[PDB]
Paper text:
Generally, a CDK forms a complex with its associated cyclin. This CDK–cyclin complex is active and acts as a serine/threonine protein kinase.
Full-length GlCDK was purified with crystallizable quality under standard purification conditions. Diffraction-quality crystals were obtained without the need for optimization. A 1.85 Å resolution apo data set was collected together with a 2.0 Å resolution data set for the AMP-bound protein using an in-house X-ray beam. The relatively high sequence identity to several human CDKs allowed determination of the GlCDK structure by molecular replacement. Residues Glu51–Thr58, Ser147–Glu151 and Ile168–Ile178 of the apo structure and residues Glu51–Gly57, Ser147–Ser150 and Gly167–His175 of the AMP-bound protein were not observed in our structures. The weak electron density for residues Ile168–Ile178 of the apo structure and residues Gly167–His175 of the AMP-bound structure is consistent with flexibility of the kinase-activation loop. The inhibitory phosphorylation sites Thr25 and Tyr26, which correspond to residues Thr14 and Tyr15 of CDK2, are observed and are unphosphorylated in GlCDK. A superposition of full-length GlCDK and human CDK2 shows the expected structural homology of the proteins, with an r.m.s.d. of around 1.26 Å over 266 Cα atoms. Although the overall structure is very similar to those of the human CDKs, the sequence deviations in key regions observed in this study indicates that it may be possible to selectively inhibit GlCDK.
Author numbering: 11 to 50, 59 to 146, 152 to 167, 179 to 308
Amino acid sequence: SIDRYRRITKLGEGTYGEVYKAIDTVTNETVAIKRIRLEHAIREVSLLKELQHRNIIELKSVIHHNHRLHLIFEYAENDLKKYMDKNPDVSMRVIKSFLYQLINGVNFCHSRRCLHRDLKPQNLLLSVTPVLKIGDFGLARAFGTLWYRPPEILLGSRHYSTSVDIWSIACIWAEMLMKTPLFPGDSEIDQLFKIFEVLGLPDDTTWPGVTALPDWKQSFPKFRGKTLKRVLGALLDDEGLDLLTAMLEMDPVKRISAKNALEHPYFSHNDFDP
């Protein structure tokens, strides 16, 4: 279609290629256009059109013309990083709303067997309390910071489960509360150290199979764990700390599902905007 889109304004370079905003002359609405640089698909990305949910940036159209690939998405002006920068005094209610909305979107996608794999504040767009909408679900798989990366990936597991995204959510949540990243590693190993420093060094009881992961080191320091309570326990009520702890299980198989997170008592109090 791509001649349906006018006033195409480059916004920058994103993960996969250049990113633009444009006017969809059919609806007169602003849309986002992402050029997807390839070379080493259309059916696969087109399946993402089914991910229609208020907390998910809608994939509106897949345009594959003259050997180039563009995705047309719902546009959101703002994003979480920009928002947190502009709103130092953001209320706990807003944070908890954003968190619920994030988990709700993720649960929706996970229920459709669609993983994100690269959640970060930069792909949490905010539209209109703003409505949080997750961008780029499915793109990491369809097309190939460590701060939000879970330990099983850092330790070289090739298996991405739904649990990956849950980890990232907890890291994002922690950052909303702390205003600094929970685990600001500067390398895969430094990232693991940052995680282990808080959560302790795993073993084959706490995380069965961990020592058989490709990048497990027998020589890792025997971190006991500062504990999440020590790190941000001042910022969160008890139920909130319980949920975060469940999302930051290092063994991905013990990590709380998005579905169970939404069912957690933390979200039973009507003190947030869904």
